[PDB]
């Protein structure tokens, strides 16, 4: 209970980013297992684009919020991509509560906006359900319910939302597309490439489209 939010994971890495100096258009990927696995499976996507991966496998959105100052705000990025809720739904650390998870995402958004960091919100991905645990429909319904709250919040607050789910979830029951996974639960490299095209378009829109003329 000394370091519940796991600030130790990236503490040394954050120190070296400081020693490297100011970076223009830095994008931080804040997330749980999905984000950690992305860096693991395609480090070039992050290195070649100057994106900073700050995913921690297993982490709850509550603990993500608690390390948001250290791993996002203090890195003074231009943009943060928030990928949260997957491990909350997986319940590896405790019972899932949609209201708390959604509230934690909102709190992270508000921390970023107060620090003048642009935000991109994202859909929790589909995954295969083990029948002994829950049905595929139950798994998919929970994910859709949380993603709906995130989308409507994003529309209300003029925040971009990247819907990985609609591109990766297969009929009839929302299983993760077999082309996009090896284990049915996590994306494989092909699945991450689908995600990369989507997120880079949203990042480039934030960094490059300015001065919306209102009439």
């Amino acid at each position, epitope marked *: 209970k000394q370091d519940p939010a796991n600030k130790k994971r990236y503490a040394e890495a954050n120190k070296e980013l400081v020693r490297k100096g100011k970076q223009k258009n830095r994008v931080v990927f804040m997330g749980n297992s999905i984000t950690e696995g992305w860096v693991a499976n395609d480090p070039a996507f992050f290195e070649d684009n100057g994106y900073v991966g700050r995913g921690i496998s297993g982490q709850t959105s509550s603990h993500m919020l608690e390390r948001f100052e250290e791993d996002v705000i203090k890195l003074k990025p231009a943009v943060v991509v928030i990928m949260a809720g997957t491990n909350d739904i997986a319940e590896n650390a405790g019972p*899932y509560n*949609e209201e708390q998870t959604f509230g934690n995402i909102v709190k992270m958004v508000e921390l970023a906006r107060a620090a003048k960091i642009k935000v991109i919100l994202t859909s929790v991905l589909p995954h295969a359900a083990a029948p002994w645990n829950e049905s595929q*429909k*139950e798994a*998919t*319904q*929970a994910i*859709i*319910n949380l*993603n*709906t709250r995130i*989308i*409507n919040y994003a*529309i209300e607050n003029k925040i971009p939302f990247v819907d990985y*789910f*609609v591109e990766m*979830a297969q*009929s*009839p*029951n*929302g299983d993760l597309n077999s082309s996009y996974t090896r284990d049915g639960v996590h994306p494989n490299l092909e699945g991450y490439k689908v995600m990369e095209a989507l997120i880079k378009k949203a990042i480039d829109k934030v960094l490059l489209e300015h001065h919306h003329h209102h009439h």
Partner: antibody, heavy 129, light 109 residues
Framework: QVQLVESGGGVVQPGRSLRLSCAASGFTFSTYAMHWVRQAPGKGLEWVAVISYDANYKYYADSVKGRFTISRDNSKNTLYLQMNSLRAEDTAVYYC??????????????????????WGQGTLVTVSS | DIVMTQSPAVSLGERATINCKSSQSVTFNYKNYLAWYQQKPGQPPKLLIYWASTRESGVPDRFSGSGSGTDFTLTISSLQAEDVAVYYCQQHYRTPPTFGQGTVEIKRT
């Protein structure tokens, strides 16, 4: 107040077609899924079809799949039901109804819907020779 | 489909109840996907209660709903002549949404 005003009912010869309209006002129609529900004379309520807020998704009761098409015109705040190849057993009062959920994501057929917070007044469709 | 069934008369001013059962749980992550409607002749159904127990605005406060999982009840605390009607319990946990039907009657001699 929220109002749903239906029109277009009447008599249809078996095998022919009919389009119903439901004109909405008093809420932001374009952000809600919309439903059709029907009631055969003296019987209960049968859900017929849903269309998502953006018209990307349409689903149908098994009893009408292949024959009915739901559509909407968000610029006119109007919902439609095109009924093809009508049968005697389609005789019913047809209701439109508003979904309670804001911008539901109807990515698969079986997903939860909202409750139906507002209903049109009903239009009678009689299928007979 | 999920099947909705009303499994059952009350004097004026007495309490009336309507029971509804669903063929599988319509409770998901602590929300009950069950609504109640009243229908009078020549009129559409009118929402009474949603999320099993939240009374709709403008509905008289003698109407309330309870239950969870597969077993739900509509209670009219003080039965009134204008309350004689068909009532529907709707599940909307799965598509197709489905409706169970039953009627409230004044008991008399």
């Amino acid at each position: 107040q929220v109002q749903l005003v239906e029109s277009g009912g009447g008599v249809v010869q078996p095998g022919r077609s009919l389009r119903l309209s439901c004109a909405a006002s008093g809420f932001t129609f374009s952000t809600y899924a919309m439903h059709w529900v029907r009631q055969a004379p003296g019987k209960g309520l049968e859900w017929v079809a849903v269309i998502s807020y953006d018209a990307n998704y349409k689903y149908y009761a098994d009893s009408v799949k292949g024959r009915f098409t739901i559509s909407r015109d968000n610029s006119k705040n109007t919902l439609y039901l095109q009924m093809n190849s009508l049968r005697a057993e389609d005789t019913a009062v047809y209701y439109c109804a508003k979904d309670s959920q804001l911008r539901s994501l109807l990515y698969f057929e079986w997903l939860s819907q909202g409750y139906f917070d507002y209903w049109g007044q009903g239009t009678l469709v009689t299928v007979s020779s | 489909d999920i099947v909705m069934t009303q499994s059952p008369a009350v004097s004026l001013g007495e309490r009336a109840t309507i029971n509804c059962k669903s063929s599988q749980s319509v409770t998901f992550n602590y929300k009950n996907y069950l609504a109640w409607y009243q229908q009078k002749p020549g009129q559409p159904p009118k929402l009474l209660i949603y999320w099993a127990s939240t009374r709709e605005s403008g509905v008289p406060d003698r109407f309330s709903g309870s239950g969870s999982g597969t077993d739900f009840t509509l209670t009219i605390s003080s039965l009134q002549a204008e309350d004689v009607a068909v009532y529907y319990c709707q599940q909307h946990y799965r598509t197709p949404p489905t409706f169970g039907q039953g009627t409230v009657e004044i008991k008399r001699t």
